[PDB]
């Protein structure tokens, strides 16, 4: 168990400010970039921000939608990453996650913030135990290549994320061997070779474009 423990969310007013925290344990925090990603029903997953190492002068990149408003930072002596959110708006509502490592193995439990270019996946697929099922992930910019570093992430009830695959086809530590990553027909793909009852879940791909991530809309997998 690596653990990423978040805090700071709540019920906030438009125009307000708020600061999120995530504390890491079980891995060498200072050696890895960290990201914030958010989920809303106005379709997250949405990558928000990243922060690199003490060797890159802690360089940062932000999604266009939060730039000039959000600030990401880290304190390596406390193994913590933070997100200062200013000028909040209704669009910032959702569940906020710290996540990183090859490139999204580990996810925090999430903290809810209530305020009051195109990656495509299959909406849904249906399999049964023992079958081999393949999920795909296409980019509107043309053929996915290894230069897009495709990751696959799994969401289970409720809002529990686990990274499966990064760097196109590298399985994260302790991920079951039935899970596999590939490139097939100019798309990224995830294959489950012998689906199990417990793989019923929502699967998200993420693709890298030079200096940022775009997440697919997610595939609902039912296992009858």
């Amino acid at each position: 168990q690596v653990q990423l423990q978040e805090s700071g969310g709540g019920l906030v007013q438009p125009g307000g400010s708020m600061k999120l925290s995530c504390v890491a344990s079980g891995f060498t925090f200072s050696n890895y970039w960290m990201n914030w990603v958010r989920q809303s029903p106005e379709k997250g997953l949405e990558w928000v921000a990243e922060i690199r190492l003490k060797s890159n002068n802690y360089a940062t990149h932000y999604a266009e939608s939060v730039k000039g408003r959000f600030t990401i930072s880290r304190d390596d002596s406390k193994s913590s990453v933070y997100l200062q959110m200013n000028n909040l708006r209704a669009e910032d509502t959702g569940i906020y996650y710290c996540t990183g490592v090859g490139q999204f193995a580990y996810w925090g439990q999430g903290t809810t913030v209530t305020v009051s270019i195109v990656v495509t996946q299959e909406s849904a697929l249906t399999t049964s135990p023992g079958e081999t099922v393949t999920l795909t992930c296409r980019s509107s910019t043309g053929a996915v290549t290894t230069s897009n570093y495709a990751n696959w992430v799994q969401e289970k009830p409720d809002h529990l994320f686990t990274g499966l695959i990064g760097g196109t086809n590298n399985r994260a530590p302790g991920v079951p061997a039935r899970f596999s990553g590939s490139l097939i027909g100019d798309k990224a793909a995830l294959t489950i070779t012998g689906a199990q009852t417990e793989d019923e879940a929502i699967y998200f791909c993420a693709l890298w474009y030079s200096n940022h991530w775009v997440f697919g809309g997610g595939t609902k997998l039912t296992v009858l």
């Binding site: 890895y32 090859g102 570093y149």
Partner: peptide, 6 residues
């Protein structure tokens, strides 16, 4: 190009 460290 992203965080490629294993």
């Amino acid at each position: 190009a992203p965080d490629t460290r294993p």
